[PDB]
Write a protein that binds this ligand. Structure first.
Ligand SMILES: [Zn+2]
Lengths: 101, 374
């Protein structure tokens, strides 16, 4: 079931794996970058939008692998970059997410 | 234990947002793997609204920028609403850009907000709660599209079988920062009040503050009174001092609207769209945070290059990164001047471009590759 105590234990382990279990040389994913922002949304929902390999974004390649996939190996997340450019929405230049070497 | 699910289709992930007396969680569809946002509201709340706005989203379904509800229902102690994942709010992106937006971004944002509001009005609804926090960007390829959330205070302003407006009322209960002047007076909220509130947000974007902000008083009641005394007293010209005249013309138009008359949305669209033409802004879908996030990422990866072959700082380092991006896109970044009490011409605004082109940053060897970037 879904209780308050269940949500606490779920969030605790996530932030434990979020603190010191994300092991990559990516700059945005680094712990130093998260100290910079008190509003975690700007990091988790805006800066993880960037792509290091130009295939998956950081929330899929780095976060999903170290935080979610470690808790549950079967935890599924899709590649939102593979999605279509839907007609109603304003055009999104994908070049803004691609990190230049 | 570590597998908490909602609606038997979505699993709960990390906590991303905390609404008033409510929580927002990132989630994924168990079958397709699509990312979703999960809103949780406890049943033991004095003012539940999640069920109500759940009905509103589904009624406003099929509109651009209107979050499609994937599932609503009850889960144990909580009411659970599941929508498609959205990016940060404009208030979040405001803080990201250190609470100052370029003239370009403001106009680009204004043009998107105009359509969002008009659509909601076109479905016989008014929002009644317009603030930067209620506008979110999408994630992925929806990142350019502005979305609208929080319809807890939303209300129908007209019947459906007939387009007859709600009657004029008073003493309606008085968000003090962006509320309409008539909202302070207890007058019923209308379509005009939404657009007026929107104007307060746009002016707030340019200046980074409002006249009623930062007012002091001994008795706390006087604190609230001074703000109301401020909104009614301040003239439109003073309100939009260092801004282009288009802003003043907007606020003057909205405050002159009758209680029941329909706004000229196309006029508001053209008014700022004409301004962007004067300011030589192009439709390239490049916001301030877009270019800042890119420039920041471009600079930081060059660190690794230097190494292999070798909180006070944040206000200083962002300033260095903002300046470098300002040099890279000199035509895009135009800002409001604090000193100015007059409405600047497009020339003075386009004068900043030359200044941004002839700008110098601190970083040496790093900027050398930034020159090599081209
Ligand atoms: Zn990484």
């Amino acid at each position: 079931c879904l209780t308050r105590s269940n949500l606490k234990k779920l969030q605790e382990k996530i932030f434990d794996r979020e603190l010191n279990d994300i092991a990559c040389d990516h700059c945005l994913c680094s712990t130093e970058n998260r100290r910079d922002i008190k509003y975690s949304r700007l990091w988790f929902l805006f800066e993880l939008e960037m792509s290091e390999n130009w295939n998956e974004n950081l929330r899929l390649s780095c976060y999903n692998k170290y935080v979610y996939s470690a808790i549950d190996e079967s935890w599924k997340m899709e590649n939102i970059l593979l999605k279509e450019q839907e007609k109603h929405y304003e055009y999104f230049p994908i070049g803004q997410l691609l990190i230049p070497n | 234990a570590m597998d908490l699910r909602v609606g038997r289709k979505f699993r709960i992930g990390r906590k991303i947002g905390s609404g008033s007396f409510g929580d927002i969680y990132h989630g994924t569809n168990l079958i397709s793997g699509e990312e979703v946002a999960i809103r949780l509201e406890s049943i033991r709340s004095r003012h539940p609204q999640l069920d109500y706005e759940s009905r509103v989203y589904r009624y406003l379904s099929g509109g651009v920028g209107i979050p499609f509800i994937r599932w609503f229902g009850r889960e144990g102690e909580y009411n659970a609403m599941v929508i498609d994942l959205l990016g940060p709010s404009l208030e979040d992106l405001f803080n990201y850009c250190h609470r100052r937006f370029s003239f370009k971004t403001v106009i680009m944002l204004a043009l998107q907000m105009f359509c969002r509001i008009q659509y909601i009005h076109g479905r016989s609804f008014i929002h009644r709660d317009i603030k930067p926090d209620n506008f979110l960007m999408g994630v992925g390829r929806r990142g350019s599209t502005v979305h609208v959330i929080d319809f807890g205070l939303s209300k129908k302003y007209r019947d459906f079988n007939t387009h007859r407006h709600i009657p004029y009322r008073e003493n309606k209960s008085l968000t003090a920062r962006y509320a309409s002047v008539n909202t302070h007076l207890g007058i019923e909220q209308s379509r005009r009040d939404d657009l007026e509130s929107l104007g307060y947000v746009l002016i707030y974007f340019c200046k980074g503050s409002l006249p009623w902000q930062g007012l002091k008083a001994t008795t706390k009641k006087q604190k609230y009174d001074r703000i109301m005394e401020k909104k009614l007293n301040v003239s439109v010209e003073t309100l939009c001092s260092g801004l282009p005249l288009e802003f003043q013309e907007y606020m003057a138009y909205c405050k002159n609207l009758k209680f029941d008359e329909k706004p000229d949305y196309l006029f508001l669209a053209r008014l700022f769209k004409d301004l962007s033409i004067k300011l030589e802004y192009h439709n390239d879908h490049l916001f301030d945070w877009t270019m800042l996030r890119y420039t920041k990422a471009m600079v930081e990866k060059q660190r690794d290059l230097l190494i292999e072959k070798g909180t006070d700082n944040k206000s200083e380092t962002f300033n260095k990164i903002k300046l470098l991006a300002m040099k890279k896109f000199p035509t895009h970044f135009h800002y409001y001047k604090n000193e100015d009490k007059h409405n600047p011409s497009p020339e003075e605004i386009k004068q900043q471009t030359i200044l941004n082109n002839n700008a110098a940053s601190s970083l040496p060897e790093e900027l050398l590759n930034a020159l090599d970037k081209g």
